[PDB]
Amino acid sequence: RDIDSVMRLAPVMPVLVIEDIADAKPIAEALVAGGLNVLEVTLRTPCALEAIKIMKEVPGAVVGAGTVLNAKMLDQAQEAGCEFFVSPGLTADLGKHAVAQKAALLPGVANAADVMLGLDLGLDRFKFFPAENIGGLPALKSMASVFRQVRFCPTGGITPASAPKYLENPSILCVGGSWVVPAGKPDVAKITALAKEASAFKRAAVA
Amino acid sequence: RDIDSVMRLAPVMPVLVIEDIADAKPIAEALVAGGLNVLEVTLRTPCALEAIKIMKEVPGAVVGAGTVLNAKMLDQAQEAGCEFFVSPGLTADLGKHAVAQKAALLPGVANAADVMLGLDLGLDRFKFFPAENIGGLPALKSMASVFRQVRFCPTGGITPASAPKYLENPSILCVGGSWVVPAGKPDVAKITALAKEASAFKRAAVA
Amino acid sequence: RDIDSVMRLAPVMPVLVIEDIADAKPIAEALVAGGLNVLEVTLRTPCALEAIKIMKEVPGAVVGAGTVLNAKMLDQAQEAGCEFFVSPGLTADLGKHAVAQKAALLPGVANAADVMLGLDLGLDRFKFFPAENIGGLPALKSMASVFRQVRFCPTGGITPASAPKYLENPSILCVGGSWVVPAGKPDVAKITALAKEASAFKRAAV
């Protein structure tokens, strides 16, 4: 499954920071019950690859790795069973490797030079990151109107209040956010409710 | 003619999106009558290279291509007769190719690394894009005071109201804007009047 | 001395634009008397390498070069006696060269791709520049929370009022600023007082 398809499965891609492996299964189950099957587990905590291997066992879960900073990490996340890969930015190295490896990479962009490098490598789906701190929807629209063939997932500072505005733009296939898994102790009921709310967001884009 | 000379010809560089080839000659005539000889035709529409070939026949018109994403597009724009090339960002590839080809490229920058990559390739004139979404004049002043040898053309969200503020800064040679060719149906009188207005903007950099 | 140590010496790294070589010694003396020993002399003026050579003779001065755009300029700044190097951004070339040369480079980053390139080269201390124009503390926090191993010095639009907010974040080791050497005629008393004031900023990191 290529990255464009992953982006269309759900309106919101939860960005998970797993601080305790005990939380992995319940978080994943709650998200999936709520209709958010596509899970980005960030490689920001030491227990992240275990957490991935655990969520991967949850039926319906499409588990990816975030915070993939280089080819090494991408290779590790792959071995662990990740179906796609998110990185906060793009380097030529990470890109060339993802392409070579047929890996569904969703790399971060912040400006035209980033997208252009992406395009040169044969990539056309990017994470706009960190969205709210680098110009927000206005900045993304400017990029979208220049790179017509490109589609985005904005992440960074997006909330339940701002997500539907981004999703009204057809250049945006989904948004990333952590508001869906709050605090630090998992409340399966709260998570499932926030996920239901979020999985019902309308998108302009043909999903 | 090198890119610095192009930038000094006029205070405003119209950013044209030509949707109907019938409009190319009249738009170009109107702009040139108005004192805006330097025309950026964006490669955002299917008829853009024809349009360039038409405007190129207009006496006094200095026609360039915008939205040049890669070396392929640059080569095509060149074959078509473009005198200069604008891109929304800069890659090492597009840059090395422009330099090699002696093409007057005016590439987009959004931050210091972009400028630094430009400088390494032997380029010192950049488009700051999309200006109003990446910090505006305050951001551009910061860059300008660091890269003293560099000069800019900001494009992106600039209006008749903001253009003279950018043009007061001597690091700015001109600005790009699309306000000069409004709507989608050409009014030669309106265009010429808006161009006269804009061609009389004072610039610190050019008397 | 590596770059992480330079960053910890003082809370504020003055960013100096020396417009007149006569001003170099007095500025450096005043800053050092004020407890800001770490001086970044930007290579933005024609007299900057002379200025560096002068400030380098000032006892207690740790002099670096700023606005190092490439390997050539780094090598020149080195020859002139600089102990560390700051650049507004990072290129693979400048980075590879700094690493190869064991030079304490503090390069500018503005987004994740910049940091990622840094990390690939073995660097983990960056200047976030120009801070106030590319998202400020909020943007920096977003970066810091993604790149947990990295530490920053924000520069660009920082003031005495905002500097302590940045320094409360433990990902930030120090800030750069020019407010400490005002105007364009040096007032040794004003400079020393502003430097004392700035040298007493608390930092979460140190």
Coordinates of C-alpha atoms in Angstrom, one line a residue:
Chain A
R1 CA 0.0 0.0 0.0
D2 CA 1.4 3.3 -1.1
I3 CA 1.3 6.5 0.9
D4 CA -1.5 8.3 -0.9
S5 CA -3.8 5.4 0.1
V6 CA -2.8 5.6 3.7
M7 CA -3.5 9.3 3.8
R8 CA -7.1 8.7 2.4
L9 CA -8.1 6.0 5.0
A10 CA -8.9 8.5 7.7
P11 CA -9.2 12.2 8.2
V12 CA -6.8 12.4 11.1
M13 CA -3.6 10.5 11.7
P14 CA -3.0 10.3 15.4
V15 CA 0.6 11.2 16.4
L16 CA 1.4 9.0 19.3
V17 CA 4.2 9.3 21.9
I18 CA 4.2 6.2 23.9
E19 CA 5.7 6.7 27.3
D20 CA 4.8 3.4 28.7
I21 CA 4.5 0.0 26.7
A22 CA 1.5 -1.0 28.9
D23 CA -0.4 1.9 27.1
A24 CA 0.2 0.6 23.5
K25 CA -2.6 -1.9 23.1
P26 CA -5.3 0.1 24.9
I27 CA -4.5 3.3 22.9
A28 CA -4.5 1.4 19.6
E29 CA -7.7 -0.5 20.4
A30 CA -9.4 2.7 21.4
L31 CA -8.3 4.6 18.3
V32 CA -9.3 1.8 16.1
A33 CA -12.8 1.3 17.8
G34 CA -13.2 5.1 17.2
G35 CA -12.5 4.8 13.4
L36 CA -8.9 6.0 13.3
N37 CA -7.1 2.9 12.0
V38 CA -3.9 4.7 10.9
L39 CA -1.5 5.2 13.8
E40 CA 1.8 7.1 13.7
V41 CA 4.0 5.9 16.5
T42 CA 6.8 8.4 16.9
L43 CA 10.3 7.1 17.4
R44 CA 10.7 9.6 20.3
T45 CA 10.8 7.3 23.2
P46 CA 13.0 4.3 23.7
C47 CA 10.0 1.8 23.9
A48 CA 8.7 2.9 20.5
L49 CA 9.6 -0.1 18.4
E50 CA 8.1 -2.5 21.0
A51 CA 5.0 -0.4 21.0
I52 CA 4.8 -0.6 17.2
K53 CA 5.1 -4.4 17.4
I54 CA 2.2 -4.4 19.9
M55 CA -0.2 -2.1 18.0
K56 CA 0.6 -4.1 14.9
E57 CA -1.2 -7.1 16.6
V58 CA -4.3 -5.0 17.0
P59 CA -6.8 -5.9 14.3
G60 CA -7.5 -3.1 11.8
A61 CA -4.5 -1.0 12.9
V62 CA -2.3 0.4 10.2
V63 CA 0.8 1.3 12.1
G64 CA 3.5 3.6 10.9
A65 CA 6.6 5.2 12.4
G66 CA 7.1 8.9 12.9
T67 CA 10.2 10.8 13.6
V68 CA 12.2 8.9 11.2
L69 CA 15.3 11.0 11.0
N70 CA 17.4 8.8 8.7
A71 CA 17.8 5.6 6.7
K72 CA 18.9 3.6 9.7
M73 CA 15.8 4.4 11.6
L74 CA 13.6 3.8 8.5
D75 CA 15.2 0.3 8.2
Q76 CA 14.6 -0.4 11.8
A77 CA 11.0 0.7 11.7
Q78 CA 10.5 -1.5 8.6
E79 CA 11.9 -4.6 10.2
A80 CA 9.5 -3.9 13.1
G81 CA 6.5 -4.1 10.7
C82 CA 5.7 -0.5 10.0
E83 CA 3.6 0.0 6.9
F84 CA 4.5 3.6 6.4
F85 CA 7.0 6.2 7.7
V86 CA 6.7 9.8 8.6
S87 CA 9.7 12.2 9.0
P88 CA 9.6 15.8 10.2
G89 CA 11.7 16.9 7.3
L90 CA 13.3 15.5 4.2
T91 CA 16.9 14.8 3.3
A92 CA 18.1 13.6 0.0
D93 CA 19.5 10.5 1.8
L94 CA 16.3 9.5 3.6
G95 CA 14.4 10.1 0.4
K96 CA 16.7 8.1 -1.9
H97 CA 16.6 5.3 0.5
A98 CA 12.8 5.3 0.9
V99 CA 12.4 5.2 -2.8
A100 CA 15.0 2.5 -3.3
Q101 CA 13.3 0.5 -0.5
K102 CA 9.8 1.0 -1.9
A103 CA 8.9 2.4 1.5
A104 CA 5.8 4.5 1.9
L105 CA 7.5 7.6 3.2
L106 CA 5.5 10.7 4.1
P107 CA 8.2 13.3 4.7
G108 CA 7.9 16.7 6.3
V109 CA 8.2 19.9 4.3
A110 CA 8.3 23.5 5.4
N111 CA 9.0 25.4 2.2
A112 CA 9.3 25.2 -1.6
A113 CA 12.8 23.9 -1.6
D114 CA 11.7 21.0 0.5
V115 CA 8.9 20.1 -1.8
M116 CA 11.0 20.5 -4.8
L117 CA 13.6 18.1 -3.5
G118 CA 10.7 15.7 -2.8
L119 CA 9.5 16.0 -6.3
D120 CA 12.9 15.4 -7.7
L121 CA 13.1 12.1 -5.9
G122 CA 9.7 11.0 -7.2
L123 CA 7.7 11.9 -4.1
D124 CA 4.5 13.9 -4.2
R125 CA 2.8 13.6 -0.8
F126 CA 4.2 15.6 2.1
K127 CA 3.5 16.4 5.7
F128 CA 3.5 20.1 6.3
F129 CA 5.2 20.5 9.6
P130 CA 5.0 22.1 12.0
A131 CA 2.0 23.6 10.4
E132 CA 0.8 26.1 12.8
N133 CA 4.2 27.5 13.5
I134 CA 5.3 28.0 9.8
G135 CA 2.3 29.9 8.4
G136 CA -0.7 27.6 8.9
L137 CA -3.4 27.1 6.3
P138 CA -2.5 30.4 4.5
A139 CA 1.1 29.2 3.9
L140 CA -0.1 25.8 2.9
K141 CA -2.5 27.2 0.3
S142 CA 0.3 29.2 -1.2
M143 CA 2.3 26.0 -1.6
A144 CA -0.6 24.1 -2.8
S145 CA -1.3 26.5 -5.5
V146 CA 2.2 26.4 -6.8
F147 CA 2.6 22.5 -6.5
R148 CA -0.7 21.5 -8.0
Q149 CA 0.3 17.8 -8.2
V150 CA 1.2 17.6 -4.5
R151 CA -1.1 16.7 -1.6
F152 CA -0.5 17.4 2.1
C153 CA -1.0 16.2 5.6
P154 CA -0.5 19.2 7.9
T155 CA 0.7 18.4 11.4
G156 CA 1.8 20.6 14.2
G157 CA -0.5 22.6 16.4
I158 CA -3.7 21.3 14.8
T159 CA -6.7 21.0 17.1
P160 CA -10.3 19.8 16.8
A161 CA -11.2 23.4 16.1
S162 CA -8.8 24.0 13.2
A163 CA -8.7 20.5 11.6
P164 CA -12.0 20.9 9.7
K165 CA -10.7 24.1 8.1
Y166 CA -7.6 22.3 6.8
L167 CA -9.7 19.4 5.6
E168 CA -12.0 21.7 3.5
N169 CA -9.0 22.2 1.3
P170 CA -8.9 19.4 -1.3
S171 CA -5.0 19.5 -1.4
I172 CA -5.2 18.2 2.1
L173 CA -5.8 14.5 2.5
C174 CA -5.7 14.4 6.3
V175 CA -4.3 16.0 9.3
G176 CA -2.0 14.8 12.0
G177 CA -2.6 15.5 15.7
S178 CA -2.0 14.4 19.2
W179 CA -5.1 15.9 20.8
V180 CA -6.8 12.5 20.4
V181 CA -4.6 10.8 23.0
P182 CA -4.5 13.3 25.8
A183 CA -2.6 13.6 29.2
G184 CA -0.4 10.6 29.9
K185 CA -2.7 7.9 31.4
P186 CA -4.9 6.3 28.7
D187 CA -8.7 6.7 29.1
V188 CA -10.0 4.2 26.6
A189 CA -13.5 5.9 26.7
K190 CA -12.2 9.4 26.1
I191 CA -9.9 8.3 23.3
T192 CA -12.6 6.4 21.5
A193 CA -15.0 9.3 21.8
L194 CA -12.4 11.8 20.5
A195 CA -11.5 9.4 17.7
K196 CA -15.2 9.0 16.7
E197 CA -15.5 12.8 16.6
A198 CA -12.4 13.0 14.5
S199 CA -13.2 10.2 12.1
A200 CA -16.5 12.0 11.1
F201 CA -14.7 15.1 9.9
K202 CA -15.6 15.9 6.3
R203 CA -12.9 16.2 3.7
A204 CA -13.1 18.0 0.4
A205 CA -10.6 15.5 -1.1
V206 CA -11.9 12.3 -2.8
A207 CA -11.5 9.9 0.1
Chain B
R1 CA 21.4 40.0 -19.9
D2 CA 22.0 38.8 -16.3
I3 CA 19.3 38.6 -13.6
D4 CA 20.3 41.6 -11.6
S5 CA 19.7 43.8 -14.6
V6 CA 16.3 42.3 -15.2
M7 CA 15.4 43.0 -11.6
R8 CA 16.3 46.7 -11.9
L9 CA 14.3 47.4 -15.0
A10 CA 11.0 47.8 -13.2
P11 CA 9.7 48.0 -9.6
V12 CA 7.1 45.3 -10.1
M13 CA 7.4 42.0 -12.0
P14 CA 3.9 40.9 -13.0
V15 CA 3.2 37.3 -12.2
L16 CA 1.0 36.1 -15.1
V17 CA -1.2 33.1 -15.2
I18 CA -2.4 32.8 -18.8
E19 CA -5.5 30.7 -19.1
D20 CA -6.4 31.7 -22.7
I21 CA -3.8 32.2 -25.4
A22 CA -6.0 35.0 -27.0
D23 CA -5.1 37.0 -23.8
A24 CA -1.3 36.9 -24.2
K25 CA -0.7 39.6 -26.7
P26 CA -3.1 42.2 -25.2
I27 CA -1.9 41.6 -21.6
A28 CA 1.7 42.0 -22.7
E29 CA 1.0 45.1 -24.7
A30 CA -0.9 46.6 -21.9
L31 CA 1.8 45.9 -19.3
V32 CA 4.5 47.2 -21.6
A33 CA 2.5 50.4 -22.5
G34 CA 2.2 50.8 -18.7
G35 CA 6.0 50.7 -18.2
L36 CA 6.2 47.1 -16.9
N37 CA 8.4 45.5 -19.5
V38 CA 9.4 42.5 -17.4
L39 CA 6.8 39.7 -17.6
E40 CA 6.9 36.4 -15.6
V41 CA 4.7 33.9 -17.3
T42 CA 4.2 31.0 -14.9
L43 CA 4.3 27.5 -16.2
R44 CA 1.1 26.7 -14.4
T45 CA -1.2 26.3 -17.4
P46 CA -1.1 24.1 -20.5
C47 CA -0.8 27.0 -22.9
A48 CA 2.1 28.7 -21.1
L49 CA 4.9 28.1 -23.5
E50 CA 2.8 29.3 -26.5
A51 CA 1.9 32.4 -24.5
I52 CA 5.6 33.0 -23.9
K53 CA 6.3 32.7 -27.6
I54 CA 3.6 35.3 -28.3
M55 CA 4.6 37.8 -25.6
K56 CA 8.2 37.5 -26.8
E57 CA 7.0 39.0 -30.2
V58 CA 5.8 42.1 -28.3
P59 CA 8.3 44.9 -28.6
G60 CA 9.9 45.9 -25.3
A61 CA 8.7 42.8 -23.5
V62 CA 11.2 41.0 -21.5
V63 CA 9.6 37.6 -21.0
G64 CA 10.5 35.1 -18.4
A65 CA 9.1 31.8 -17.1
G66 CA 7.9 31.3 -13.6
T67 CA 7.2 28.1 -11.7
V68 CA 10.2 26.4 -13.0
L69 CA 10.5 23.3 -10.8
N70 CA 13.4 21.5 -12.5
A71 CA 16.0 21.4 -15.2
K72 CA 13.6 19.9 -17.7
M73 CA 11.2 22.9 -17.4
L74 CA 14.1 25.3 -17.5
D75 CA 15.3 23.8 -20.8
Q76 CA 11.8 24.0 -22.2
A77 CA 11.3 27.5 -21.1
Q78 CA 14.7 28.4 -22.7
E79 CA 13.9 26.7 -26.0
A80 CA 10.7 28.8 -26.0
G81 CA 12.8 32.1 -25.8
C82 CA 12.6 33.0 -22.1
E83 CA 15.2 35.6 -21.0
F84 CA 15.0 34.7 -17.4
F85 CA 13.6 32.0 -15.1
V86 CA 11.9 32.2 -11.7
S87 CA 11.4 29.2 -9.4
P88 CA 9.5 29.0 -6.1
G89 CA 12.5 27.4 -4.4
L90 CA 16.0 26.2 -5.2
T91 CA 17.5 22.8 -5.5
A92 CA 21.2 22.1 -6.1
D93 CA 20.2 20.4 -9.4
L94 CA 18.1 23.3 -10.8
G95 CA 20.9 25.7 -9.7
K96 CA 23.9 23.8 -11.1
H97 CA 21.9 23.5 -14.4
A98 CA 21.0 27.2 -14.6
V99 CA 24.6 28.2 -14.0
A100 CA 25.9 25.7 -16.5
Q101 CA 23.4 26.9 -19.0
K102 CA 24.2 30.6 -18.4
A103 CA 20.4 31.0 -17.6
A104 CA 19.3 34.0 -15.6
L105 CA 17.6 32.2 -12.8
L106 CA 15.9 34.0 -10.0
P107 CA 15.2 31.2 -7.5
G108 CA 13.0 31.3 -4.5
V109 CA 14.5 31.3 -1.0
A110 CA 12.7 31.0 2.3
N111 CA 15.5 30.8 4.8
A112 CA 19.3 31.1 5.2
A113 CA 20.2 27.7 4.1
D114 CA 18.4 28.3 0.8
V115 CA 20.4 31.5 0.3
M116 CA 23.6 29.8 1.3
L117 CA 23.1 27.1 -1.2
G118 CA 22.4 29.8 -3.8
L119 CA 25.6 31.6 -2.9
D120 CA 27.6 28.3 -3.2
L121 CA 26.4 27.9 -6.7
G122 CA 27.4 31.5 -7.6
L123 CA 24.0 33.0 -7.4
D124 CA 23.3 36.2 -5.4
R125 CA 19.8 37.4 -6.4
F126 CA 16.9 35.5 -4.9
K127 CA 13.1 35.7 -4.8
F128 CA 11.8 35.6 -1.3
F129 CA 8.7 33.4 -1.6
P130 CA 6.0 33.3 -0.5
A131 CA 6.9 36.5 1.2
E132 CA 3.8 37.3 3.3
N133 CA 3.5 33.7 4.5
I134 CA 7.1 33.2 5.7
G135 CA 7.6 36.4 7.8
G136 CA 7.2 39.3 5.4
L137 CA 9.3 42.4 5.4
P138 CA 10.6 41.8 9.0
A139 CA 11.9 38.3 8.0
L140 CA 13.4 39.7 4.8
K141 CA 15.2 42.5 6.7
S142 CA 16.7 40.0 9.0
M143 CA 18.1 38.0 5.9
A144 CA 19.2 41.2 4.2
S145 CA 21.2 42.4 7.0
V146 CA 23.0 39.0 7.3
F147 CA 23.6 38.5 3.5
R148 CA 24.8 41.9 2.6
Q149 CA 25.9 41.0 -0.9
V150 CA 22.5 39.6 -1.8
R151 CA 19.4 41.3 -3.3
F152 CA 15.8 40.2 -3.3
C153 CA 12.5 40.2 -5.1
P154 CA 9.8 39.4 -2.6
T155 CA 6.7 37.7 -4.1
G156 CA 3.7 36.2 -2.4
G157 CA 0.8 38.2 -1.0
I158 CA 2.2 41.6 -1.9
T159 CA -0.3 44.3 -2.8
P160 CA -0.3 47.8 -4.0
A161 CA -0.4 48.9 -0.3
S162 CA 2.6 46.8 0.9
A163 CA 4.8 47.0 -2.2
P164 CA 6.2 50.5 -1.5
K165 CA 7.3 49.4 2.0
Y166 CA 9.3 46.5 0.5
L167 CA 10.7 48.8 -2.1
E168 CA 12.0 51.3 0.5
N169 CA 14.5 48.7 1.5
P170 CA 17.6 48.9 -0.8
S171 CA 18.2 45.2 -0.6
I172 CA 14.9 44.8 -2.6
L173 CA 15.2 45.5 -6.2
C174 CA 11.6 44.8 -7.1
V175 CA 8.6 42.9 -6.1
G176 CA 6.4 40.4 -7.8
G177 CA 2.6 40.5 -7.9
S178 CA -0.4 39.4 -9.7
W179 CA -2.7 42.3 -8.7
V180 CA -1.8 44.1 -12.0
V181 CA -3.6 41.6 -14.2
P182 CA -6.8 41.1 -12.3
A183 CA -9.9 38.8 -12.7
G184 CA -9.6 36.5 -15.7
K185 CA -10.7 38.6 -18.7
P186 CA -8.2 41.3 -19.8
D187 CA -9.2 45.0 -19.6
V188 CA -6.3 46.6 -21.5
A189 CA -7.2 50.0 -20.1
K190 CA -7.3 48.8 -16.4
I191 CA -4.1 46.8 -16.9
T192 CA -2.2 49.7 -18.4
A193 CA -3.4 52.1 -15.6
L194 CA -2.4 49.6 -12.9
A195 CA 0.9 49.2 -14.5
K196 CA 1.6 52.9 -14.8
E197 CA 0.7 53.2 -11.1
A198 CA 3.1 50.4 -10.3
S199 CA 5.9 51.5 -12.6
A200 CA 6.1 54.8 -10.6
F201 CA 6.8 53.2 -7.3
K202 CA 10.0 54.6 -5.8
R203 CA 12.7 52.2 -4.9
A204 CA 15.6 52.9 -2.6
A205 CA 17.8 50.7 -4.8
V206 CA 17.1 52.2 -8.2
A207 CA 16.8 55.8 -9.3
Chain C
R1 CA 36.9 23.4 23.4
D2 CA 33.8 22.0 21.7
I3 CA 30.7 24.1 20.9
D4 CA 28.4 22.8 23.6
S5 CA 30.9 24.2 26.2
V6 CA 31.1 27.6 24.5
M7 CA 27.2 27.7 24.6
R8 CA 27.2 27.0 28.4
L9 CA 29.8 29.8 29.3
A10 CA 27.2 32.5 29.2
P11 CA 23.5 33.0 28.8
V12 CA 23.8 35.5 25.9
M13 CA 26.2 35.5 23.0
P14 CA 26.6 39.0 21.7
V15 CA 26.3 39.3 18.0
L16 CA 28.7 42.0 17.0
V17 CA 28.8 44.0 13.8
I18 CA 31.9 46.0 13.9
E19 CA 31.5 49.0 11.7
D20 CA 34.7 50.7 12.8
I21 CA 37.9 48.9 13.9
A22 CA 38.5 51.6 16.6
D23 CA 35.5 50.1 18.4
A24 CA 36.7 46.5 18.6
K25 CA 38.9 46.7 21.7
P26 CA 36.6 48.8 23.8
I27 CA 33.5 46.7 22.9
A28 CA 35.3 43.5 23.8
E29 CA 36.7 44.9 27.0
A30 CA 33.3 46.1 28.0
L31 CA 31.5 42.9 27.3
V32 CA 34.2 40.9 29.1
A33 CA 34.1 43.2 32.2
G34 CA 30.3 42.6 32.1
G35 CA 30.6 38.8 32.2
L36 CA 29.9 38.1 28.6
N37 CA 33.2 36.5 27.5
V38 CA 31.9 34.8 24.4
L39 CA 31.9 37.2 21.4
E40 CA 30.5 36.5 18.0
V41 CA 32.1 38.9 15.5
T42 CA 30.0 38.7 12.3
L43 CA 31.8 38.6 9.0
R44 CA 29.5 41.2 7.7
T45 CA 31.8 44.1 7.4
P46 CA 35.1 44.5 5.6
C47 CA 37.1 45.1 8.7
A48 CA 35.8 42.0 10.6
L49 CA 38.9 39.8 10.5
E50 CA 41.0 42.7 11.8
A51 CA 38.5 43.2 14.5
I52 CA 38.7 39.5 15.5
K53 CA 42.5 39.8 15.7
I54 CA 42.1 42.7 18.0
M55 CA 39.4 41.2 20.3
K56 CA 41.4 38.0 20.4
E57 CA 44.2 40.0 22.2
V58 CA 41.7 41.0 24.9
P59 CA 42.1 38.9 28.0
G60 CA 39.0 36.9 28.9
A61 CA 37.6 37.0 25.5
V62 CA 36.4 33.9 23.7
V63 CA 36.1 35.2 20.1
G64 CA 34.2 33.5 17.4
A65 CA 33.2 34.4 13.9
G66 CA 29.6 34.8 12.7
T67 CA 28.1 34.9 9.3
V68 CA 30.4 32.2 8.1
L69 CA 28.8 31.3 4.8
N70 CA 31.3 28.7 3.5
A71 CA 34.4 26.7 4.0
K72 CA 36.6 29.5 2.7
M73 CA 35.3 31.9 5.3
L74 CA 35.6 29.3 8.0
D75 CA 39.3 28.7 7.1
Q76 CA 40.0 32.5 7.1
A77 CA 38.2 33.0 10.4
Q78 CA 40.2 30.1 11.8
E79 CA 43.6 31.5 10.6
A80 CA 42.6 34.8 12.2
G81 CA 42.3 33.0 15.7
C82 CA 38.5 32.3 16.0
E83 CA 37.7 29.6 18.6
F84 CA 34.2 28.9 17.3
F85 CA 32.1 29.6 14.2
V86 CA 28.5 30.6 13.7
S87 CA 26.6 30.5 10.4
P88 CA 23.1 31.6 9.7
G89 CA 22.2 28.4 8.0
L90 CA 23.8 25.0 7.2
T91 CA 25.1 23.6 4.0
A92 CA 26.4 20.1 3.6
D93 CA 29.7 21.6 2.5
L94 CA 30.2 23.9 5.4
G95 CA 29.2 21.1 7.8
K96 CA 31.5 18.4 6.3
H97 CA 34.3 20.9 6.4
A98 CA 33.8 22.0 9.9
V99 CA 33.6 18.3 11.1
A100 CA 36.7 17.4 9.1
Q101 CA 38.6 20.4 10.5
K102 CA 37.4 19.7 14.1
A103 CA 36.0 23.3 14.1
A104 CA 33.4 24.3 16.7
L105 CA 30.6 25.2 14.3
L106 CA 27.3 26.4 15.5
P107 CA 25.1 26.4 12.4
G108 CA 21.8 28.1 11.8
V109 CA 18.6 26.0 11.4
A110 CA 15.1 27.1 10.5
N111 CA 13.3 23.9 10.0
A112 CA 13.4 20.1 10.5
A113 CA 15.3 19.4 7.3
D114 CA 18.1 21.7 8.4
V115 CA 18.3 19.9 11.8
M116 CA 18.2 16.6 10.1
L117 CA 21.1 17.5 7.8
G118 CA 23.0 18.6 10.9
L119 CA 22.3 15.4 12.7
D120 CA 23.5 13.4 9.6
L121 CA 26.8 15.2 9.8
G122 CA 27.2 14.5 13.5
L123 CA 26.2 17.9 14.8
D124 CA 23.6 18.3 17.6
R125 CA 23.9 22.0 18.6
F126 CA 22.2 24.6 16.4
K127 CA 21.4 28.3 16.2
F128 CA 17.7 28.8 15.5
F129 CA 17.7 31.7 13.2
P130 CA 16.2 34.2 12.7
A131 CA 14.1 33.1 15.7
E132 CA 11.4 35.8 16.0
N133 CA 10.7 35.8 12.3
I134 CA 10.3 32.0 11.8
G135 CA 7.9 31.1 14.6
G136 CA 9.7 32.2 17.9
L137 CA 9.6 30.1 21.0
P138 CA 6.5 28.2 19.9
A139 CA 8.2 27.0 16.8
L140 CA 11.4 26.2 18.7
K141 CA 9.4 24.1 21.2
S142 CA 7.9 22.1 18.4
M143 CA 11.4 21.3 17.1
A144 CA 12.8 20.6 20.5
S145 CA 10.1 18.1 21.2
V146 CA 10.9 16.2 18.0
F147 CA 14.7 16.4 18.3
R148 CA 15.1 15.5 21.9
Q149 CA 18.9 15.1 21.7
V150 CA 19.5 18.6 20.2
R151 CA 20.1 21.9 22.0
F152 CA 19.7 25.4 20.6
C153 CA 20.8 29.0 20.7
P154 CA 18.0 31.1 19.3
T155 CA 19.1 34.4 17.6
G156 CA 17.1 37.0 15.7
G157 CA 14.8 39.6 17.3
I158 CA 15.5 38.5 20.8
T159 CA 15.4 41.3 23.4
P160 CA 16.1 41.6 27.1
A161 CA 12.3 41.0 27.6
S162 CA 12.0 37.8 25.6
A163 CA 15.5 36.3 26.4
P164 CA 14.5 34.9 29.8
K165 CA 11.4 33.1 28.3
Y166 CA 13.7 31.3 25.8
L167 CA 16.2 30.5 28.6
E168 CA 13.5 28.9 30.7
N169 CA 13.4 26.1 28.2
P170 CA 16.0 23.5 28.9
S171 CA 16.6 22.8 25.2
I172 CA 18.1 26.3 24.9
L173 CA 21.6 26.8 26.2
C174 CA 21.9 30.5 25.4
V175 CA 20.5 33.2 23.2
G176 CA 22.2 35.5 20.7
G177 CA 21.5 39.2 20.6
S178 CA 22.8 42.5 19.5
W179 CA 20.9 44.6 22.0
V180 CA 23.9 44.6 24.3
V181 CA 26.1 46.7 21.9
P182 CA 23.6 49.3 20.8
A183 CA 23.6 52.2 18.3
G184 CA 26.9 52.6 16.5
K185 CA 29.2 54.6 18.9
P186 CA 30.4 52.5 21.8
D187 CA 29.5 53.5 25.4
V188 CA 31.7 51.3 27.5
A189 CA 29.6 52.0 30.6
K190 CA 26.3 51.2 28.9
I191 CA 27.7 48.1 27.4
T192 CA 29.2 46.8 30.6
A193 CA 26.0 47.4 32.4
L194 CA 23.8 45.7 29.8
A195 CA 26.3 42.8 29.8
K196 CA 26.1 42.4 33.6
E197 CA 22.4 42.4 33.4
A198 CA 22.4 39.8 30.7
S199 CA 25.0 37.6 32.3
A200 CA 22.7 37.2 35.3
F201 CA 19.8 35.6 33.3
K202 CA 18.8 32.2 34.7
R203 CA 18.8 29.2 32.5
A204 CA 16.9 26.0 33.0
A205 CA 19.8 24.1 31.2
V206 CA 22.6 25.4 33.4

